[PDB]
């Protein structure tokens, strides 16, 4: 089955800096979230189809998540990816896809827009439990990228 869920996350910084700040993820997160140790490129060229391993430390314990890349669209500032393995994904998911995109709030901010996909195996249902995980997590993560790019002013 599938269930979807959307949110959306409001931000000071205007939505083309955000999105070339997003574009840079990979050495931006290590840097500010602690859990995250590394993100590596296992597989492809940063595009669609691209394999990412997030290595990440929880209770003092190396686990590692798995990230595809499913689309690009740079002129609307839009990015798909997707969950594919490691402890993010419970074990009654196939893969849970985020979708993005960022809009010109009012001000000269961003709206950034969350449409969240979790694809499930036959009839099993999604743990609320773990969505409230992947939401703080995910939330966190725009944080990361916003809070680097209003640290760094000159970078974006
Ligand atoms: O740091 C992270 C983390 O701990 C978890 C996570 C999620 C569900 C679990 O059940 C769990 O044990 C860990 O997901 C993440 C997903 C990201 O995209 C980025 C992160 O930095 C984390």
């Known amino acids: ?28 997160t290590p840097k500010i979230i602690d859990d995250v140790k ?11 189809g691209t394999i990412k391993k997030l290595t990440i430390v929880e209770d003092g314990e190396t686990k590692f998540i798995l990230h595809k890349v499913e689309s690009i669209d740079e002129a609307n500032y839009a990015y798909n990816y997707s969950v594919v393995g ?7 998911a196939e893969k849970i896809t985020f979708e ?34 992947g939401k703080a997590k995910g939330e ?5 990228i916003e809070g680097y790019v209003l640290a760094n002013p000159t970078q974006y």
């Open 86 to 92: 490691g402890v993010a994904l419970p074990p009654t």
């Open 38 to 48: 590394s993100v590596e490129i296992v597989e492809g060229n940063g595009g669609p």
């Open 100 to 133: 993005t995109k960022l809009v010109e709030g009012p001000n000269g901010g961003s709206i950034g827009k969350l449409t969240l996909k979790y694809h499930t195996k036959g009839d099993a249902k999604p743990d609320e439990e773990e969505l409230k995980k």
């Open 140 to 144: 966190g993560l725009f944080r990361a």
């Open 1 to 28: 089955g599938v269930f979807t869920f959307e949110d959306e996350i409001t931000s000071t910084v205007p939505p083309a800096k955000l999105y070339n700040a997003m574009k840079d993820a990979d050495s931006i």
